[PDB]
Structures are given as C-alpha cells and as structure tokens.
Amino acid sequence: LAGLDTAIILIAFIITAAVLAYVAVNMGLFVTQKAKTTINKGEETASTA
C-alpha cells in the first residue's frame, strides 16, 4: 500500500526542487555577469577624464 503513494510524492518533490535549482543557477549566472559589467563600468568611470 504505502510503497507507492510515497514514491509519487517523492517524484513530485524532486522535480519541484530541480525546478528551483534550474532557476537559481540561471539567475545567479545572470546577476553575477551584471555585477562583472558594473565593476568594469565603475573602473571606466573612475579612470576616464
């Protein structure tokens, strides 16, 4: 009996966590590149005159 309903919920919870993982990594890659670009623009702003 219980060796099935539990397995289904496990499948669903794994997929749910994998979806957060997917989003978090993508958005970390995005934001860290925005930071890289900003740091470069800050140095350009301080240097150029």
Binding site for a second copy (CB under 8 A): 3-4, 7-8, 10-11, 14-15, 17-18, 21-22, 25, 27-29, 31-32, 34-35, 38-39, 41-42, 45-46, 49
Coil, helix or strand at residue 7: helix
- What would the two tokens of residue 15 be? 């997929």
User: To the nearest whole angstrom, how small is the minimum distance from the Cβ of residue 3 to a second copy?
Assistant: 5
Name residue, tokens 């060796």.
3
CB of 27 to a second copy, least distance (A): 7
CB of 17 to a second copy, least distance (A): 6
Dihedral (CA of 15, 21, 22, 24) sign: positive
